[PDB]
Design a protein around this ligand. Structure first.
Ligand code: Y01
Ligand code: Y01
Ligand code: Y01
Lengths: 9, 570, 570
């Protein structure tokens, strides 16, 4: 289970 | 409010509207893709002809190419406006921030301020650039999807829309249960660690009594309590994932069964069902995405308001006074002044003090080391307003002259003279620009710092590397006193610390030239009484009340709290 | 070195093997079921009959139910093992930490150890609880799915294996370019911000020179230099997303078109292509997951090798001492002992000093008032070894006594006494088993503390709340020496701090009546020289060297540094 999503724009 | 945030994007609206336009285009492309995809699939299963040529090419070209290009240029100009927002906002905050009274700096901590600056600028720039962006993206996407659901099958859309909220409700219920229990676990572990930290903190006192293994024992007891707590939330996670899995299973299979009934009963073509379930999966994706990012957005907007409270805080006193004569006589006078700190108005650190300053002589003043001693230094630099009295220069108070001209005419040295991460030739005239090399080296030779200037690895124009950690006390003393003298002010103020590592050399220098030959009323606040023997006019006060004035032989004519201190300190 | 981590997972093998088994069966269900989903669609294209739904449900029920069941079991078991391993590591590390010598805590920090006792232990539990889990899950899943797609159609398998490396290569190289650019932007941002940080951190001087406008100028100059580069960064990001979307597009549509041609070629049923595209889909999901986890896994294993830096670390001081008589007399002596700190052996604080202490009498000592003569108290409390000479007790060296018995016999007070977040009677009856409460009452009488404790919120059973920040230091020293008196120590250590701002009658009663009227051989250090009157054996030192002894009446003759310091008090 991941905590937070990746960074994207 | 957020109207300030509204106003701080006004020169950016062209990029904003172009961004939103291209965003909406990429949205329409991404939502138009799957229905044509399903038409192509219903071709490839039912009518295995060369309409698949046509449907495949219209699937790829306009849809995929336009969506990709729109998304790309969208993200690009969003990064542009991110950069521009961060620049303008950081510049305006810092421009506003330095223009405040010193009391603001005494009240607030410093590292808090820079953390506020950097972190919150990046936070609000991320807020405008990323979160709002993808939020609008996903909302217009999901509205397009539900539009296609009401167009395709009102039956199927009604089924999935009575389904999905049940999933959302039970998942939220059991997830809140789960998260609450894990937070309790975290709290208990934090409690036990706080106990252990309090033990290890002053632990030599514990070693005085040899209690250590008992601290291990009570630590183990707390951890056993943690263990017995933890088993329950383990079972909770078990039940939560059980329920979520079984629910998604049963709703999905009901979808597939009823859709099969509809398609074999001859209601809609198969590709409609294909596109339908495709749209269900993309809907679930977008819903999970927005539910993820909403909380981060809320954190950002909560973080946003910490900036604007200081963006436009009104300073108290402005440097409205403006006067700059060509020269002066250097006549300074005190007049029944009763300053107190604004931060704690109970006390009285000053009370009704009056004395003039002789043009040319060296005025001296030493306190009893407990009362007001380092306060007139704050008066003479306009760093505060004053409660009683009024201090004038040449008849005119400090609110008459120009502020920059005031700093031009009077220098200042502290006791802990901080420097900057710059070169020496930089740091020698930190204030004054347009300086020549020869005046600087001449003053440095007058400073008697010139010795340890030249012997360095780069000598004159070396740099204060590793944040200036390559000097010592007397070094930076001589440096700062040079930094005073390079302006050549008509009035100097000198008060140094208690260490005074100069082995009587600099004092011989000033009482050789810079105490007599330099016609400046150089007021001296002195510690360690190393100069009270050699002065021109000496006073001493406690909190406003003077007990002795005159030359130091009048101080010898009445040694009351004068001779008692100097006989004490050898 | 990683076998150390094995060396603590050892008592957990049963939970481990059960977890691995259930993980395995969950993964097997997950990698099976979409092939049979394709079989169901193979029925929906051809054998649309009673055999369809039978096969469909008997697949999906068993498959999805077993999957979610095993996944739940696996999650619960890994939750349990996370809790157990975290507990064991925390207990063992904190236990081994406290038995280290005092010089460790002298050299090492404090908050670093608190980080090492909470955060990285949490991290190393997260390693074996999460990262190994999802890594093993996804690798066995990707092996299973690549086996299936290699089994179905080696042609389209070769297509995928010619395609995916191209995507991965171009994405990696363009993302590397991108990330290098963005990190350049961030580093330039920090480099620009630290200048303004330096200004705002010590702004008194620049306000004393009024150059803040120039600071804003050079600031925005730096920031303009930044955003010029940020333009290029954003353009590169645009090219990245363009290329990624375009390439994934063209490879996907090539797969689909070749699959359609091969379906009409007739050797491949539709369900084969169905399985191929779905399985390709999860593969991409699994590749995403492993690419996400690997970096955090490396982070965790990096953080892991800090707890074993100390959890097996040898103590430097033996504690074999065992002497514990029923009672003792207390002629503590010295033998020309010398001492320096273990940090720097050249910095000496003690050189060749000896003196006895007569039991049952009051004996004070003040050295040169510059040396940290509390080092003598430190060598009393056996906090360090000694270099030269020896220190004994009643003929026996202080080591050979039992450690707990030693700390039971001789008490101590510090200068700033500290306390815990326990009740005051617990804070008093601290290092000793549940001695009755009336002795605490007697101490509060003898400490003269029985009064002011009645003016608390409860009295005796009250607790020093608010993290212990509600009492003045005078009563802190009072309750501290009260903590000594309940031990009934035969020999005592007392050193009043510099303030001594209490009622001060307790000090003369300490010199005369409190302990001086009983069998309490007390050693005294003091700053307030009101104690130099009431004394028996005054010894004075300098830099760890004895100069005088005897009564202060003899020191009236040898007033050198004595009478010099008597008048230095006034
Ligand atoms: C079980 C969860 C909480 C953890 C397992 C790992 C998960 C990160 C994900 C990865 C992909 C997910 C799967 C994506 C595919 C779907 C198919 C779905 O099958 C249903 O019949 C829907 C119709 C169909 O897909 O045919 C059941 C859930 C499942 C296996 C999902 C279950 C959870 C999975 C395995
Ligand atoms: C986080 C996002 C990426 C979702 C993660 C899971 C997906 C990677 C997987 C899991 C289940 C998959 C879906 C299972 C159902 C199928 C139906 C399938 O329709 C059939 O292929 C039509 C027949 C044909 O194409 O000829 C299209 C792909 C799709 C949506 C799959 C697309 C990829 C999905 C969503
Ligand atoms: C709107 C974008 C900029 C951000 C939204 C999140 C994206 C990272 C994800 C979410 C859903 C994804 C899409 C889901 C549908 C697929 C269809 C897929 O079609 C494939 O080419 C095979 C089918 C075909 O040949 O058309 C192409 C990628 C795409 C658009 C995915 C591209 C990446 C998307 C948009």
């Amino acid at each position: 289970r991941r905590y937070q999503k990746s960074t994207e724009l | 409010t957020l109207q300030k945030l509204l106003s701080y994007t006004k020169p950016d609206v062209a990029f904003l509207v172009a961004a939103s336009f291209f965003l909406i285009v990429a949205a329409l492309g991404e939502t138009f893709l799957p229905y044509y995809t399903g038409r192509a699939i219903d071709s490839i299963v039912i009518q295995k002809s060369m309409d698949q040529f046509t449907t495949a090419v219209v699937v790829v070209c306009l849809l995929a190419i336009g969506s990709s290009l729109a998304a790309g240029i969208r993200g690009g100009i969003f990064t542009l406006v991110f950069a521009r927002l961060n620049i303008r906002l950081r510049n305006c905050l810092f421009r506003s921030l330095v223009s405040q009274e010193t009391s603001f700096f005494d009240e607030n901590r410093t590292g808090d301020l820079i953390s506020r600056l950097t972190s919150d600028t990046t936070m609000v720039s991320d807020l405008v650039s990323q979160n709002i962006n993808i939020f609008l993206r996903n909302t217009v996407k999901v509205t397009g999807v539900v539009v296609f659901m009401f167009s395709l099958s009102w039956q199927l859309s009604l089924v999935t829309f009575m389904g999905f909220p049940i999933i959302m409700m039970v998942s939220n219920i059991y997830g809140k249960y789960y998260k609450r229990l894990s937070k309790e676990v975290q709290s208990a572990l934090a409690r036990a660690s706080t106990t252990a930290e309090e033990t290890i903190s002053a632990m030599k006192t514990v070693r005085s009594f040899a209690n250590e293994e008992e601290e291990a024992e009570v630590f183990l007891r707390k951890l056993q309590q943690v263990y017995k707590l933890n088993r329950k939330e383990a079972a909770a996670y078990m039940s939560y994932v059980w329920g979520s899995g079984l629910t998604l299973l049963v709703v999905q299979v009901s979808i597939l069964y009823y859709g099969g009934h509809l398609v074999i009963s001859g209601q809609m073509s198969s590709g409609n069902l294909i596109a339908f379930i495709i749209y269900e999966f993309v809907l679930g994706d977008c819903m999970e995405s927005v539910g993820s990012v909403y909380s981060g957005l809320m954190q950002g907007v909560g973080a946003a308001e910490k900036v604007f409270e200081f963006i436009d805080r009104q300073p108290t006193m402005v440097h409205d006074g403006s006067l700059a004569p060509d020269h002066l006589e250097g006549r300074v006078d005190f007049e029944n002044v009763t300053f107190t700190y604004r931060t704690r108005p109970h006390t009285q650190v000053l009370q009704n003090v009056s004395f003039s300053l002789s043009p040319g002589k060296v005025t001296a003043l030493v306190g009893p080391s407990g009362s007001g001693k380092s306060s007139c230094v704050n008066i003479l630099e306009n760093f505060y307003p004053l409660q009683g009295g009024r201090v004038l220069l040449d008849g005119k108070p400090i609110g008459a002259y120009d502020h920059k001209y005031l700093h031009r005419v009077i220098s200042l040295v502290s006791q802990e003279p901080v420097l900057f991460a710059r070169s020496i030739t930089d740091n020698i005239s930190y204030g004054l620009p347009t300086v020549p090399f020869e005046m600087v080296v001449e003053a440095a030779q007058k400073a008697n710092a010139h010795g340890f200037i030249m012997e360095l690895q780069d000598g004159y124009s070396t740099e204060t590397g590793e944040k200036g950690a390559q000097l010592s006390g007397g070094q930076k003393q001589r440096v700062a006193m040079a930094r005073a003298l390079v302006r050549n002010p008509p009035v100097l103020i000198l008060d140094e610390a208690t260490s005074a590592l100069d082995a009587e050399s600099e004092y011989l220098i000033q009482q050789a030239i810079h105490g007599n030959l330099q016609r400046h009323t150089v007021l001296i606040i002195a510690h360690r009484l190393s100069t009270v023997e050699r002065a021109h006019l000496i006073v001493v006060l406690d909190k406003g009340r003077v007990v002795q004035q005159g030359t130091h032989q009048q101080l010898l004519a009445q040694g009351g709290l004068y001779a008692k201190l100097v006989q004490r300190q050898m």
